[PDB]
Curated annotation (Swiss-Prot), chain A:
Notes on activation and inhibition: Regulated by chloride and fluoride, but not bromide. Chloride increases angiotensin I and decreases angiotensin II cleavage. Inhibited by MLN-4760, cFP_Leu, and EDTA, but not by the ACE inhibitors lisinopril, captopril and enalaprilat. Highly potent and selective in vitro ACE2 inhibitors were identified.
Impact after mutating H16A: Increases slightly the interaction with RBD domain of SARS-CoV-2 spike protein
The protein's name: Angiotensin-converting enzyme 2
Binding-site residues, Zn(2+): H349, H353, E377
From Swiss-Prot, chain B:
Effect of substituting V80P: In strain: Omicron/XBB.1.5, Omicron/EG.5.1
Region: Immunodominant HLA epitope recognized by the CD8+, residue numbers: 83-91
Part of the whole protein covered: 366 to 563 of 1273
Native organism: Severe acute respiratory syndrome coronavirus 2
Protein's name according to its UniProt entry: Spike protein S1
Disulfide feature: C14-C67, C26-C160, C115-C123
Outcome of swapping L3I: In strain: Omicron/XBB.1.5, Omicron/EG.5.1
Consequence recorded when altering K52N: In strain: Beta/B.1.351, Omicron/BA.1, Omicron/BA.2, Omicron/BA.2.12.1, Omicron/BA.2.75, Omicron/BA.4, Omicron/BA.5, Omicron/BQ.1.1, Omicron/XBB.1.5, Omicron/EG.5.1; May enhance affinity to human ACE2 receptor
BetaCoV S1-CTD domain ranges (all copies): 1-162
Length: 588, 198
C-alpha cells in the first residue's frame, strides 16, 4: 500500500491512548501536592508503570516503519522521540549499573550535612550573609572534601556508561546527544547541523565579554574594603567569595554593593495592602495583562481546578513553583499565593509557561511540548521581564503616580538584574563546554581537575583558595548533574529573553534601550508572538525564530542594548581598578 | 414555538429553511437522530464539512434543510476518572452514505494482510473511547447533539403546526374565517342545527 499512509494511522492509535494514561499519572500527583498522604504515592506509581510499559511496546513496533518514508515533514519529527530506547539501550547487565549511579549521587547530594546543617536553604544563607573570611571558607572547604570524595568513583564511571549509551542511538558522545534537540530534522533548507552548535556560541560570547569585564571589576573593587588583605584590585576573586556554594546565584552580592544609596528602589508590597488584595487575586490582574497584548483569554477550568490559595502550615502541601500540564484541555498551576513582592513576579513567570500549553491544544499528544529544552523556559522569561519594568507598574493599579524616577533609578535596576540574568552566563558557557571535552574524549581521565581550574580564569575568572589535587571533584555536586538534567538549556534562555523582548518593543512604537519598554495597547506586538507558539514542534526552531526576530541564528546585540545605560556608567567609574582579571594570582 | 425561546440549549442553529417559518409549515416525515460527541467535534457537524465523524459514522447531506439541536450535558452522563461508556470508529475500509446506521463491525485493514477479526499488526482497533470528565476543557465535554431531518414526499403530510386562534366578536360587519370558508358579514343567532359531521 503506502508506508506514509500507515504512519498516520499508527499515530492516531497511540494518541487516543496516551492522553488517558498520562492524565492518570498527573492527576494522582496533584492530589499528593494538595494533601501529603501515603495513598496518593501508590496511585502515581501504578499509573506511571502502565505508561512505561505501554511506551516500550509501541517503540518496538515503530522500528519496522522506515524513517525516510515521510513526506509530510511532521511524522518524522514525532517518531524521533518515540523510537528511542532510553537508558535501557545497552545490555541487561549494564542496565542496572547506570541507574544505580543516578540514585547514589542523588542521595549523597540530598543528605549532604556539614557538622547539624541542611542543604537548601542550609548552606545558601551561610555563604551569602557572613562578611567574614574565617567563616564562609570552612563551609566551602568541608563540602569539597567530603561530598566530592564520595562522588569521585561514581563520576568516573558516569562518563564511560553515558558514552556507550549515546553511541547506541547513532550519535557521538553524551554532549552530542543534547545537540540533537537543536538539530533540524524536518523541513529542508532551514537545517541546523550539530557541528554548527560548536561555533556561534563561541563567537557571540566574545562580544559580550567586555560587558562582563566592566561588571567583574566593579564588584572586585567594591568588596576590596571588606577584604583588604584578600581581594586585590589587580588580582582575582576566590571561589568562596561569590555568594554561592557553586558560584551560580550572585544576587546576594547586591546587598554589599550599592552604587546609589540615596535613591530607594521600587516596592509593590505596600501597594497591595492598601488596595486590599483577597490573597486569592494577583491572577485576576495577571489575566488582563495578556489580553492587552492580544494573546487569547485563558480557559474556564483553570479558575475551578487549580488551587490558587495558601492553606498555610495547618495543611500539608508542597506548592513548589512548577507548571503542570495534565492535558485534555486541563491546565493547573501549583503555587501558594501570598501578599508579597516576589510572588507578584513569580506568578507572571509561570503564567507564560501555561500559556504555551494552551497554544497547541488542538494538536495531538506528540506535539504537546516546546521546540527544544532551551525554548520553553524562554517563553516565561519575556513575560516576567516586561512586567518588572518600573514604568509599566506605575500606569496600573499598584504603585503611586507620585513616585519619582530618573536616570539614577534605572542604574539600580540594571545592576540587580546583571547579577542573575547575565551573572550566571559565563558560568553556563564554561560548565557545559568543559563536560563536552570529557564526554567526547579530548581530556584524559587524569586531567579533569587540572583543566577545570584553567578554564575558570579564562572565561569566568575564579581562582582556587585551597590548592586541591586530583581525587577532588566539583561538577559532580550539582542539582542538575545528580538529577541528569541538561545545563545548555539555560544558555539559550538568556539570549532568547532579549531577542523576543526587542521584537515586541520595536513594533510597539518604542525605540532606544529596553529598560523602560511597556507592552500595552499593542495588538501588532501580540499577534506576531502567537505565530510560533501555535505551531509547536511541527516546524523547526530556525523557521519559528525568523517569524519573530528575523534571523535563524542567535544574536548577542539585543543582550547589549538592554544593558547600555549600565555599561556606560561602569566605563566612567572603573578607572581605579583593573579592567578584567589576572590569571597568575592566588589569595593564599 | 416553545423550542426556540426555551433558553436552555447551548447550540440551536438551523440550515436551509428559516427557524421561524417551520412552525406552521407541514412536514411529511420528521426524523430524530441523537448522538453524544465531544465539544470540539461539534464544528464538524455541518452541511458542508467533513472529518472523522461525518465520513465513517453519521454522514449528513450537503443540502440538509433542517436544524441542529445540541445542549450541554456535563452534569449528566459524565464521571471523573475516564469515560468508558461511549465508543466511535476511527477508520474504515469504505465510505458510508448519508442517513445510514453503522452495522458491520469489522477490523480496519491498513496493510495487505487479512486480520480475521483478531487485533494484531496492521490491524488497529477502530472502536476508541472518549474522555468525558468534569475536569477537562471545553472541547472535551459531552454534548447531546440531536439532528432533526425534514423530508417531504408525495404523501399527504399530517404533521403541520398549531394555528393561533383569537376571540369571537359579533354585532359587526367584519371579516371572519371559520375553517376554509372566508365570509364577511354580521354573525347573528340561529335556531336551526346542522349535522354532526358537516
Amino acid at each position: 500500500s503506502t508506508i506514509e499512509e500507515q504512519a498516520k494511522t499508527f499515530l492516531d492509535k497511540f494518541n487516543h491512548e496516551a492522553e488517558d494514561l498520562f492524565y492518570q499519572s498527573s492527576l494522582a500527583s496533584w492530589n499528593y501536592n494538595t494533601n501529603i498522604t501515603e495513598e496518593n504515592v501508590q496511585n502515581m506509581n501504578n499509573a506511571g508503570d502502565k505508561w512505561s510499559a505501554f511506551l516500550k511496546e509501541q517503540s518496538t513496533l515503530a522500528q519496522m516503519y522506515p524513517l525516510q518514508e515521510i513526506q509530510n515533514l511532521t511524522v518524522k519529527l514525532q517518531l524521533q522521540a518515540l523510537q528511542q530506547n532510553g537508558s535501557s539501550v545497552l545490555s541487561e547487565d549494564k542496565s542496572k549499573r547506570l541507574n544505580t549511579i543516578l540514585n547514589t549521587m542523588s542521595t549523597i547530594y540530598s543528605t549532604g550535612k556539614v557538622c547539624c546543617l541542611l542543604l537548601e536553604p542550609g548552606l545558601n544563607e551561610i555563604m551569602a550573609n557572613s562578611l567574614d573570611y574565617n567563616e564562609r571558607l570552612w563551609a566551602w572547604e568541608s563540602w569539597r572534601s567530603e561530598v566530592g570524595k564520595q562522588l569521585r568513583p561514581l563520576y568516573e564511571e558516569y562518563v564511560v556508561l553515558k558514552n556507550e549509551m549515546a553511541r547506541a542511538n547513532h550519535y557521538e558522545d553524551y554532549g552530542d546527544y543534547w545537540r540533537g534537540d537543536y538539530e533540524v530534522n524536518g523541513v529542508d533548507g532551514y537545517d541546523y547541523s550539530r557541528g554548527q552548535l560548536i561555533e556561534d556560541v563561541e563567537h557571540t560570547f566574545e562580544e559580550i565579554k567586555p560587558l562582563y569585564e566592566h561588571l567583574h571589576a566593579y564588584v572586585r573593587a567594591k568588596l576590596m574594603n571588606a577584604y583588604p588583605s584578600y581581594i586585590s584590585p589587580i588580582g582575582c576573586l576566590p571561589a568562596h567569595l561569590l555568594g554561592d556554594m557553586w558560584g551560580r546565584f550572585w544576587t546576594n552580592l547586591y546587598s554589599l554593593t550599592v552604587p546609589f544609596g540615596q535613591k530607594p528602589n521600587i516596592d509593590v508590597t505596600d501597594a497591595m495592602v492598601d488596595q486590599a488584595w483577597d490573597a486569592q487575586r494577583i491572577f485576576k490582574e495577571a489575566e488582563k495583562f495578556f489580553v492587552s497584548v492580544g494573546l487569547p483569554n485563558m480557559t474556564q477550568g483553570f479558575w475551578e481546578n487549580s488551587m490558587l490559595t495558601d492553606p498555610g502550615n495547618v495543611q500539608k502541601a508542597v506548592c513548589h513553583p512548577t507548571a503542570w500540564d495534565l492535558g485534555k484541555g486541563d491546565f493547573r498551576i501549583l503555587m501558594c499565593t501570598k501578599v508579597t513582592m516576589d510572588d507578584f513576579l513569580t506568578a507572571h513567570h509561570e503564567m507564560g509557561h501555561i500559556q504555551y500549553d494552551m497554544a497547541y491544544a488542538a494538536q495531538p499528544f506528540l506535539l504537546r511540548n516546546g521546540a527544544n529544552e532551551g525554548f520553553h523556559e524562554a517563553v516565561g522569561e519575556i513575560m516576567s521581564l516586561s512586567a518588572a519594568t518600573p514604568k509599566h507598574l506605575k500606569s496600573i493599579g499598584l504603585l503611586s503616580p507620585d513616585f519619582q524616577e530618573d536616570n539614577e533609578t534605572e542604574i539600580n535596576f540594571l545592576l540587580k538584574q546583571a547579577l542573575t540574568i547575565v551573572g550566571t552566563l559565563p558560568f553556563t558557557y564554561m560548565l557545559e563546554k568543559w563536560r563536552w571535552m570529557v564526554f567526547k574524549g579530548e581530556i584524559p581521565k587524569d586531567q579533569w581537575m587540572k583543566k577545570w581550574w584553567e578554564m575558570k580564569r579564562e572565561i569566568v575568572g575564579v581562582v582556587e583558595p585551597v590548592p586541591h589535587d586530583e581525587t577532588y571533584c566539583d561538577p559532580a555536586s550539582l542539582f542538575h548533574v545528580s538529577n541528569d538534567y541538561s545545563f545548555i538549556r539555560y544558555y539559550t534562555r538568556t539570549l532568547y529573553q532579549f531577542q523576543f523582548q526587542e521584537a515586541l518593543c520595536q513594533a510597539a512604537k518604542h525605540e532606544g534601550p529596553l529598560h523602560k519598554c511597556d507592552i500595552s495597547n499593542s495588538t501588532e506586538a501580540g499577534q506576531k508572538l502567537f505565530n510560533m507558539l501555535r505551531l509547536g514542534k511541527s516546524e523547526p526552531w530556525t523557521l519559528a525564530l525568523e517569524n519573530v526576530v528575523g534571523a535563524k541564528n542567535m544574536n548577542v546585540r539585543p543582550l547589549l542594548n538592554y544593558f547600555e545605560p549600565l555599561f556606560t556608567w561602569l566605563k566612567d567609574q572603573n578607572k581605579n581598578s583593573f579592567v578584567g582579571w589576572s590569571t597568575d594570582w592566588s589569595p593564599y | 414555538s416553545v423550542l426556540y425561546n426555551s433558553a436552555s440549549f447551548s447550540t440551536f442553529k438551523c440550515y436551509g429553511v428559516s427557524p421561524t417559518k417551520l412552525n406552521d409549515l407541514c412536514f411529511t416525515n420528521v426524523y430524530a437522530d441523537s448522538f453524544v460527541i465531544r465539544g470540539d467535534e461539534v464544528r464538524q457537524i455541518a452541511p458542508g464539512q467533513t472529518g472523522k465523524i461525518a465520513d465513517y459514522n453519521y454522514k449528513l447531506p450537503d443540502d440538509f434543510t433542517g436544524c441542529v439541536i445540541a445542549w450541554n450535558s456535563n452534569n449528566l452522563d459524565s464521571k471523573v476518572g475516564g469515560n468508558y461508556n461511549y465508543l466511535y470508529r476511527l477508520f474504515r475500509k469504505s465510505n458510508l452514505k448519508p442517513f445510514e446506521r453503522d452495522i458491520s463491525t469489522e477490523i480496519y485493514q491498513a496493510g495487505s494482510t487479512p486480520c480475521n477479526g483478531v487485533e494484531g499488526f496492521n490491524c488497529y482497533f477502530p472502536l476508541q473511547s472518549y474522555g468525558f470528565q468534569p475536569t477537562n476543557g471545553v472541547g472535551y465535554q459531552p454534548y447531546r447533539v440531536v439532528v432533526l431531518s425534514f423530508e417531504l414526499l408525495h404523501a399527504p403530510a399530517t404533521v403541520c403546526g398549531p394555528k393561533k386562534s383569537t376571540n369571537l366578536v359579533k354585532n359587526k360587519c367584519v371579516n371572519f374565517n371559520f375553517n376554509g370558508l372566508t365570509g364577511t358579514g354580521v354573525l347573528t343567532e340561529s335556531n336551526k342545527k346542522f349535522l354532526p359531521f358537516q
